[PDB]
PDB file of C-alpha atoms in Angstrom:
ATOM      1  CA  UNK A   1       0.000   0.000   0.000  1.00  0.00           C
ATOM      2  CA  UNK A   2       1.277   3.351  -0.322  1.00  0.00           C
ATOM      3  CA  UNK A   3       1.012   4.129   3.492  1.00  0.00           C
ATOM      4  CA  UNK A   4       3.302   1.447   3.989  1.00  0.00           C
ATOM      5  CA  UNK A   5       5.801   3.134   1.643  1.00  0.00           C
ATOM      6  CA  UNK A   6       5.038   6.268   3.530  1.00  0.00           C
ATOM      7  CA  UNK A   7       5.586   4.714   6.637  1.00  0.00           C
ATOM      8  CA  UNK A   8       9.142   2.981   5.275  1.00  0.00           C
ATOM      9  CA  UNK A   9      10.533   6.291   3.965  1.00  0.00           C
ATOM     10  CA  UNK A  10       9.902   7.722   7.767  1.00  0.00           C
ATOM     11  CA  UNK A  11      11.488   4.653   8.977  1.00  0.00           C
ATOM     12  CA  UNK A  12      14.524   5.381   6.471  1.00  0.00           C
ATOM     13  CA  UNK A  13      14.651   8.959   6.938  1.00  0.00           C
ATOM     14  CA  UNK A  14      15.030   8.304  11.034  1.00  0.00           C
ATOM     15  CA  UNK A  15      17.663   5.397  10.179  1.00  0.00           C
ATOM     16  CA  UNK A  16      19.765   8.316   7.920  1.00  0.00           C
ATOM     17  CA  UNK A  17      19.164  10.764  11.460  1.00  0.00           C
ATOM     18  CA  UNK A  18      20.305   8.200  13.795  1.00  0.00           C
ATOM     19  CA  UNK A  19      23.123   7.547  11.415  1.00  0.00           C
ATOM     20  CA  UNK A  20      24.024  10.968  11.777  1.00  0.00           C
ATOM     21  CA  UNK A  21      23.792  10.948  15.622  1.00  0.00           C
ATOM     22  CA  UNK A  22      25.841   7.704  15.884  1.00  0.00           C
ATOM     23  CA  UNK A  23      28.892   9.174  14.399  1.00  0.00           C
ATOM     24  CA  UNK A  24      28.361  12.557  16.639  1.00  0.00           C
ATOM     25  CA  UNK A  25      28.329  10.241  19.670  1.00  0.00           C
ATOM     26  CA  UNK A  26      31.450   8.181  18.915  1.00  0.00           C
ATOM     27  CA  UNK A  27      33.231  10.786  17.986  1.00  0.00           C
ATOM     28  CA  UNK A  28      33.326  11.518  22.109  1.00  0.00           C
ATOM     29  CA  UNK A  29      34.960   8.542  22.355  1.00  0.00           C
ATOM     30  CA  UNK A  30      38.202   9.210  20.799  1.00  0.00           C
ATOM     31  CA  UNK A  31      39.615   6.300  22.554  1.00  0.00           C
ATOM     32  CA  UNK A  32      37.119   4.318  21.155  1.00  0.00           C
ATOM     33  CA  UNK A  33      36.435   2.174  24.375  1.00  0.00           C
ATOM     34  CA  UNK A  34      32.641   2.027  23.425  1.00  0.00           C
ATOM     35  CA  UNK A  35      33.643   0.632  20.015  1.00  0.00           C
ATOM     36  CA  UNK A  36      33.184  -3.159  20.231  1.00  0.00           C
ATOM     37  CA  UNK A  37      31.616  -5.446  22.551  1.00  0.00           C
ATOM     38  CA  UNK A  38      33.928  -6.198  25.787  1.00  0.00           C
ATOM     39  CA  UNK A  39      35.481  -9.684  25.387  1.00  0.00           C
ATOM     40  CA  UNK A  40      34.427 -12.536  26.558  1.00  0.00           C
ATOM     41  CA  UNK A  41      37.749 -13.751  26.081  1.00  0.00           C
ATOM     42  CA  UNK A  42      39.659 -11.085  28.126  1.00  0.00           C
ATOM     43  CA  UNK A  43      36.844 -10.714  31.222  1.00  0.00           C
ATOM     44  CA  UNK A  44      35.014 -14.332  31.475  1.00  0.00           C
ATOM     45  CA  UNK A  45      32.572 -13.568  34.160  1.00  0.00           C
ATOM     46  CA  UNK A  46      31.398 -10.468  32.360  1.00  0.00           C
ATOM     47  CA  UNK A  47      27.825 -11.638  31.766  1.00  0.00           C
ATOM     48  CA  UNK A  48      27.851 -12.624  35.624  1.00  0.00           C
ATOM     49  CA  UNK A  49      27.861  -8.788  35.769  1.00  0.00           C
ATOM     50  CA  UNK A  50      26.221  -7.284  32.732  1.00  0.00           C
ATOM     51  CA  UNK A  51      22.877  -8.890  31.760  1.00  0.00           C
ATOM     52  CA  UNK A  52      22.878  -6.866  28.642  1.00  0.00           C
ATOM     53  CA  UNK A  53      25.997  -5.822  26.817  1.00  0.00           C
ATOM     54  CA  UNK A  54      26.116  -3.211  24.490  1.00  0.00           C
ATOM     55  CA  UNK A  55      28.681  -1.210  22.368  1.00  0.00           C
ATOM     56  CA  UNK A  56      29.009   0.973  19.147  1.00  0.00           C
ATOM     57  CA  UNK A  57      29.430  -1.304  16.351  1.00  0.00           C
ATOM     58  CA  UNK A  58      26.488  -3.498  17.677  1.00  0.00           C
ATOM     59  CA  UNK A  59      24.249  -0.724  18.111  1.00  0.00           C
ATOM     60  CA  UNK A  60      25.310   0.053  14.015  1.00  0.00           C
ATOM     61  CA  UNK A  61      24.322  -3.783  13.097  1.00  0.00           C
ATOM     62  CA  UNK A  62      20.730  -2.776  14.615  1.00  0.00           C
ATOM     63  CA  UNK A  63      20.177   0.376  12.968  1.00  0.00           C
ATOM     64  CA  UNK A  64      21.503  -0.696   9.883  1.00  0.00           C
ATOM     65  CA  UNK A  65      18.698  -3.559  10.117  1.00  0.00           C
ATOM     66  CA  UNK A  66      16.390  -0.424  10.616  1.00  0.00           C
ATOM     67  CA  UNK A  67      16.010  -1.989  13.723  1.00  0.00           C
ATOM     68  CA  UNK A  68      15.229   1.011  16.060  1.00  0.00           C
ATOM     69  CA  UNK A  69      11.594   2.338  15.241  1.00  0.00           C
ATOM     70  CA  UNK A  70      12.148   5.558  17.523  1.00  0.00           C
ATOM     71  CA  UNK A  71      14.407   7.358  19.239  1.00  0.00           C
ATOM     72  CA  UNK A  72      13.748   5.923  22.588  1.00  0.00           C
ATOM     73  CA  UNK A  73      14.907   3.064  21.762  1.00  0.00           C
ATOM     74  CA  UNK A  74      18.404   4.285  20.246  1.00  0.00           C
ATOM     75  CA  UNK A  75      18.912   6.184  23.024  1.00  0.00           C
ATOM     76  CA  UNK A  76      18.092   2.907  25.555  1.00  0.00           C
ATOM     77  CA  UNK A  77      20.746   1.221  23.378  1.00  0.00           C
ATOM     78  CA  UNK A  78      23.030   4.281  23.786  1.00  0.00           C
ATOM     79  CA  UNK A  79      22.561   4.206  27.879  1.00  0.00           C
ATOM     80  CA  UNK A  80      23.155   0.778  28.080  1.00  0.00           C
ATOM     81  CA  UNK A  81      26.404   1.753  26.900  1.00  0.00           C
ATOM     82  CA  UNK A  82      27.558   4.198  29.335  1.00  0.00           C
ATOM     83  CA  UNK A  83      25.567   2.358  32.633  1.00  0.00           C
ATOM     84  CA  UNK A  84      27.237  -0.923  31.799  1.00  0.00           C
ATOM     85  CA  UNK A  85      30.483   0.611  31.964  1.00  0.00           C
ATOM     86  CA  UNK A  86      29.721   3.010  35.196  1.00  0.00           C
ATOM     87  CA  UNK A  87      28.730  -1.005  37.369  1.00  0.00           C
ATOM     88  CA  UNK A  88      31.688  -2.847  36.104  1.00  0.00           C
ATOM     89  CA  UNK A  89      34.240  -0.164  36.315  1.00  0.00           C
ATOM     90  CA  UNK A  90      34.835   1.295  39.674  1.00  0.00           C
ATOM     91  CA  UNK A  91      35.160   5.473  39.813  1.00  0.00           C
ATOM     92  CA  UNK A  92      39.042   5.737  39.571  1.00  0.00           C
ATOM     93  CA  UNK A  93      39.022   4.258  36.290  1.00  0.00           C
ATOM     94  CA  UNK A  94      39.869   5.003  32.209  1.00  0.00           C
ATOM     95  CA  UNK A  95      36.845   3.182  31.371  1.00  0.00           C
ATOM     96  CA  UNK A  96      34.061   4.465  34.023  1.00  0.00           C
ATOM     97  CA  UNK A  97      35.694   8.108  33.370  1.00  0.00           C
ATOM     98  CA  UNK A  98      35.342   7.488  29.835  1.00  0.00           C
ATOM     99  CA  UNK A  99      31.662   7.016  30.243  1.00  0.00           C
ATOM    100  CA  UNK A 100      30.588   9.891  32.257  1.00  0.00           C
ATOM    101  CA  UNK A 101      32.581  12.422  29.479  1.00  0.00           C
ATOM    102  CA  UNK A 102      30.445  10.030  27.216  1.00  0.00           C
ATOM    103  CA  UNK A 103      26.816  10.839  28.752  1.00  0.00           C
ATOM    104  CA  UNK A 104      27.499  14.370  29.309  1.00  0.00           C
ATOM    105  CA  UNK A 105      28.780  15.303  25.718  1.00  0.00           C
ATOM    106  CA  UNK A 106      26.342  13.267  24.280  1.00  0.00           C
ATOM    107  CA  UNK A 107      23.463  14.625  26.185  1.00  0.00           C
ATOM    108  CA  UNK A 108      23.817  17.755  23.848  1.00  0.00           C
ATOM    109  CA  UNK A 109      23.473  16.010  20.268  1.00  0.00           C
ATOM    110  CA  UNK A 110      20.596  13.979  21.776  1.00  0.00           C
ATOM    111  CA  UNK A 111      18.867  16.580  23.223  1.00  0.00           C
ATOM    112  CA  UNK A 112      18.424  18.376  19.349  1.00  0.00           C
ATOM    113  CA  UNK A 113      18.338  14.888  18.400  1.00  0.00           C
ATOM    114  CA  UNK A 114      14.990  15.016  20.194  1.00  0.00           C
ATOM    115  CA  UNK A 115      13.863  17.789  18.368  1.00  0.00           C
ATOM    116  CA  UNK A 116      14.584  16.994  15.059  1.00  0.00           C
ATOM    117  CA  UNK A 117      12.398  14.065  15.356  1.00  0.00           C
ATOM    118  CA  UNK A 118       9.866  15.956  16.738  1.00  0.00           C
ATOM    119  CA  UNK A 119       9.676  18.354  14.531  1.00  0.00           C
ATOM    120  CA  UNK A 120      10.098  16.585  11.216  1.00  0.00           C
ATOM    121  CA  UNK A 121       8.066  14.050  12.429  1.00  0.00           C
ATOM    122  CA  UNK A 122       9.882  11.090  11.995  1.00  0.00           C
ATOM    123  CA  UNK A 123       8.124   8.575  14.325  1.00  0.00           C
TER     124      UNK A 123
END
């Protein structure tokens, strides 16, 4: 039908938006820490910790799928993130300090991010 194809092209135009707002986020992770999923290999007992893992590159896989239908749910994917990191890590750490510059840079591009959507109506 053609609302179905009007419906798809909102889908794709949020997809190109989150895009956008993926590469604004990583880029306050020069050290790209959030990049890839923390190894199994080099911390075993990480699920014992962190029911749900997330990083970067997975949260591409997903929204190259389309997969997010809002941006509630990018932005869940995008707190998982930083909270994972803030349990495992303790304070005095490169990785927990690495998330809280994380969630308070981002916090500006998501916060227009927020707007944009709103405004051009895009779910």
């Amino acid at each position: 039908s053609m609302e179905q194809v009007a419906m798809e092209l909102r889908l794709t135009e949020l997809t190109r938006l989150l895009r956008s707002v993926l590469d604004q986020l990583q880029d306050k992770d020069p050290a790209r820490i959030f990049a890839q999923p923390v190894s199994l290999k080099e911390v075993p007992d990480y699920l014992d910790h962190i029911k749900h893992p997330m990083d970067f590159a997975t949260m591409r896989k997903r929204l190259e799928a389309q997969g997010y239908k809002n941006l509630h749910e990018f932005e869940e994917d995008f707190d998982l993130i930083i909270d994972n990191c803030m349990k495992y890590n303790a304070r005095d750490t490169v990785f927990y300090r690495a998330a809280v510059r994380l969630r308070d840079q981002g916090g500006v591009v998501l916060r227009q991010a927020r707007r944009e959507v709103d405004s051009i109506g895009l779910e």
